[PDB]
Symmetry: C2
Subunit: 99 residues, 2 copies
């Protein structure tokens, strides 16, 4: 799909047996989703920085699907005002910016 930017690029994403709404964010290094009970082991990770850090759960090699396209990558699980699809997942989708 080609996605124009007149509106916020919000997509439906299938992850962990759920469907969530998330923002495609080329300015974000990582993908962060609000709480979902992903299975298996995780690593602690600290995100943020300005004013302090938030501790989140890093899950590796997680499958997500966006607009019929699948992608495997790290998903951070923790509090976030909006669910963020960041560059680590955008590259797995083949996502590019074009102008």
């Amino acid at each position: 799909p080609q996605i124009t930017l007149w509106k916020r690029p919000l997509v439906s994403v299938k992850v962990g047996g759920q469907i969530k709404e998330a923002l495609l964010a080329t300015g974000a290094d990582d993908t962060v989703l609000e709480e979902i009970n992903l299975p298996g082991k995780w690593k602690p990770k600290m995100i943020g920085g300005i004013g302090g850090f938030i501790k989140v759960r890093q899950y590796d090699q997680v499958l997500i699907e966006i607009c019929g396209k699948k992608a495997i990558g790290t998903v951070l699980i923790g509090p976030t005002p909006v669910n963020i699809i960041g560059r680590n997942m955008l590259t797995q989708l083949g996502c590019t910016l074009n102008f």
Copy 2:
């Protein structure tokens, strides 16, 4: 140009007679640049929100150039950790996401 996302999408941008480094950020509504002495009148604007707002200077119909392509739009001038090219300018460049 086609821009892959293995690295942060940082570009050189010509604005206000200067050249600055800025991030192409599809998750950002607005374009925010650190201090540049743009000419003429401006409107107060408050950005941010989480933990409070920052007052910035809104300049309208400002020309910027990125990778040989020109674009006219609103530029907010104020403190920002990184210079942000947001959707309001990305649409003016013809920028689209593609996967």
